[PDB]
Symmetry: C4
Subunit: 241 residues, 4 copies
């Protein structure tokens, strides 16, 4: 009636979907990053533009694949924002965040398994503050970048349709992927662009440097604030539902 449990099984398949999607996200995107960076021929890579596309377009693809199954978060800040507005229950939120973090670690681990030399040599796909910017600028860049993203996800929620056996709204994947694309064009030079604690974490775990670990709180704090401000903006100021 729910007698089948149903549901349950749907909940755990959602967690798996978010685990595998975040793995694919990090594999494809960090492989792109390392592939660009190891390139010897000047203008012989996909460029920073290709990297930006890999991040936005994989979000587009992955949210498309997972919207109806898990709600398609692929991103602890997105889950956190939706949690705050009560579109995600606390247990699912935490399970999604763990799934995403674990998926991200595996995805980056795979890139490193495939091209260990250039992976270590060229920065591990990790986020950190680039030379010429301070921590406050980096944090502000991450807050506002995640705000664009989570503002987009809220505007992209279906108020009638939900992920399977849940009340997690279905998301329109394209505007969300484009938001990620745009924020990369702006934020790559500053931090590489985080806007996704799982993506930053997965890379910090595998690359394992003190420099990167020191900057890592930015990539949790910035996005969670950006996400919280988007949630409040959408739900309370625009009201908006």
């Amino acid at each position: 009636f729910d007698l089948g449990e149903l549901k349950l099984w749907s909940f755990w398949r959602a967690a798996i979907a978010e685990f595998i999607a975040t793995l694919l996200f990090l594999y494809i995107t960090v492989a792109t990053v390392i592939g660009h960076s190891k390139e010897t021929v000047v203008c012989g890579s996909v460029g920073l533009l290709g990297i930006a596309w890999a991040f936005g377009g994989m979000i587009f693809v992955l949210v498309y694949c997972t919207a109806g199954i898990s709600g398609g978060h692929i991103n602890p800040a997105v889950t956190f924002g939706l949690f705050l507005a009560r579109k995600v229950e606390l247990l699912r939120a935490l399970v999604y965040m763990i799934a995403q973090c674990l998926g991200a670690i595996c995805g980056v681990g795979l890139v490193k398994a495939f091209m260990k030399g250039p992976y270590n040599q060229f920065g591990g796909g990790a986020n950190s503050v680039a030379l010429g910017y301070n921590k406050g600028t980096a944090l502000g860049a991450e807050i506002i970048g995640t705000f664009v993203l989570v503002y987009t996800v809220f505007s992209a929620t279906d108020p009638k349709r939900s992920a399977r056996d849940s009340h997690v709204p279905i998301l329109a994947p394209l505007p969300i992927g484009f938001a990620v694309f745009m924020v990369h064009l702006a934020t790559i030079p500053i931090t590489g662009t985080g806007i996704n604690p799982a993506r930053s974490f997965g890379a910090a775990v595998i690359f394992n440097s003190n420099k990167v670990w020191d900057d890592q709180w930015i990539f949790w704090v910035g996005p969670f604030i950006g996400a919280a401000v988007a949630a409040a903006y959408h739900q309370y100021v625009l009201r908006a539902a």
Copy 2:
């Protein structure tokens, strides 16, 4: 019945939506511009192509987020065009234009707060006529570029659906974002591409140079004419509604 006021509150949330959207537009786009320009490595930026994408794609994203709330103008020329055809009442028009101008100033102000050195050094994201072109060419480039844009918005209007508690038509965001993209590919070398008085103004205000301020009337006059000609073309010649 309207007893709730309703409406009113919708009107002011629309103004806020247009304020915040235009802020996000200028922040993301001018951060992209300054990020590209400050780059020391040849072919190590997102390129002029990435800039063009930042402008079109943020229009796509922002019109998507705001279509149902404000009508998604993000641009005084767009509001002016729709005003002329009576799809926007005069008070809303003026309120939107002020909101957009204010949002633009804040968005550019933020880029400058984050990277003040490269912001001043590399042109402030401002529009002005590039060397090799005259004022008439620059003005013609802006008229015709805004005409493509506003012609697209008119063709993208929903004749049945309107923004919340208003008669401002809902807009299809993608063709509009693509129109902005295309016009940048053509007009970046000439003026940087304005086609948006709020975007040109916000940057002139923050960057504050006599060179830029001298060229600024182009970026109001060109787009308002382009917008007026699109409105007349759509409503009167194609008839079209």
Copy 3:
């Protein structure tokens, strides 16, 4: 009942729509081309990729704007293909082709008015066979490129919905714009990519060189054959309607 004439007026507004759309197409695209070519800074233009995007994306935008008004051809080969399959009556076909040719001339004329020096210096946006290819290769490249395009338009026809007061099918603009994009990626090095007699003609007229005029039959013959083969393929072999 038709008593209003109706219709008529719709027919002539369709011709105007195709005139203005093809003007916008050539202006935006050839301005992009000349802007890229005149650039002194290595990797400081939108690149051949940006050019390819200007052509596909303006087709996307323009077919979107004009689909419901004229059927959105913007291209004598497209009109010819649809004529052959009886989706366009002969008088409209010829009127569209003239409108498109005239629009193209004006669009290129405008680019030249705006940047006459770099316009003449850098090839006028004209199509011709590049060094290293023969005429048969150029013609085969144009046949097959137009075949992709017109095959896409046929697959993108709405069998139930037509342009205003006509039986010219409505077209889905995006796949068509993408087809143009893809064919440019392949054919730019060979001919610059024609796949559109009006686009090739408009540029030959304004640029006015013997070299270009000598190659011009390729850009009528190739696309008309490509279009005829697509029509036969769709209607007769796939059957398909």
Copy 4:
């Protein structure tokens, strides 16, 4: 009733559709590749980014054209994945795979007919393992790349609508084209990206080198495994239908 045969004729038109689509895919994409590679001017080609776009965007276009006619596979791994999940009958599967392989050979043959010198000089559009990677890395890159692709196709299946006179599901073309795009951004530096046995085979046949033929099993085995794992993941783990 089926009395007309109907059906039959639909089956053989589907095979033709998959033959011609895969021909167009290889022609446009390998012409792009050779056009980029033969370019003498540094940053004067469409770049690796343009190549990646040619592959994803032609998949988008071609699946769009053929979805309703054949199901739009254009790719033996896609057909194999859908076969395994019983969405394609065995005879159609084998006929599609042969059609695709034959189409691919012709498409590459045409590129070579048009630019034989640069075609041989610059690698023939063939896939093989690049210097710096081993066979296991190349194979893992192909498994996981095809997994993204076929996972996307499964998520993009219409459970109610099928290709003409068949039970082959209709596919949403855009997410599929984007998946191909993304996988190229990541896998071009490793193998050139195969993820399509017909595409790898067609190029090996025409280019005919021992180096390439030695690596060719990777481009059958990787994609068939990636496809089988996606099928199992979608049908059995996500369940998912």
